[PDB]
Curated annotation (Swiss-Prot):
Any one GO MF annotation of this record: phosphate ion binding
Role description: Could act as an H1-type linker histone. Has been shown to bind DNA.
Domain H15: 6-80
Protein family per UniProt: Belongs to the histone H1/H5 family.
Name this polypeptide is given: Histone H1
Main location: nucleus
Residue numbers bearing the Phosphoserine modification: 4
Subcellular location(s) per record: Nucleus; Chromosome
Keyword Cell inner membrane: no
GO biological process terms held by the UniProt record: chromosome condensation; negative regulation of DNA recombination; nucleosome assembly; regulation of DNA-templated transcription; regulation of double-strand break repair; sporulation
Annotated GO CC locations: chromatin; nucleosome; nucleus; protein-DNA complex
DNA-binding in keyword set: yes
Organism in which the protein naturally occurs: Saccharomyces cerevisiae (strain ATCC 204508 / S288c) (Baker's yeast)
Section covered of the full-length record: 171 to 258 of 258
Keywords on record: Chromosome, DNA-binding, Nucleus, Phosphoprotein, Repeat
């Protein structure tokens, strides 16, 4: 599907990959991480990334960017609903 760019925020990185994974319906952290690390070589090389990855999602859920109904382990859903040119 849509190729992932580079040098985005960890939030934007997921926001780009999410719609690709299951049409942005949602994907497990392993699936997402594997995808993010694969499409973004910088996060692939970075071992510390994986922690920041979890931190990014944590920031996303309050932001309404991503939603994680299960919790830490579960499935990251591309919410991206509280922003859609609603005017």
């Amino acid at each position: 599907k849509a190729s992932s760019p580079s040098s985005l925020t960890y939030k934007e990185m997921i926001l780009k990959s999410m719609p690709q994974l299951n049409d942005g319906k949602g994907s497990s952290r392993i699936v997402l991480k594997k995808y993010v690390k694969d499409t973004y070589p910088i996060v692939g090389s970075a071992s510390n990334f994986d922690y920041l990855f979890n931190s990014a999602i944590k920031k996303c859920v309050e932001n309404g960017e991503l939603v994680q109904p299960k919790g830490p382990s579960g499935i990251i859903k591309l919410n991206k609903k509280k922003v859609k040119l609603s005017t």
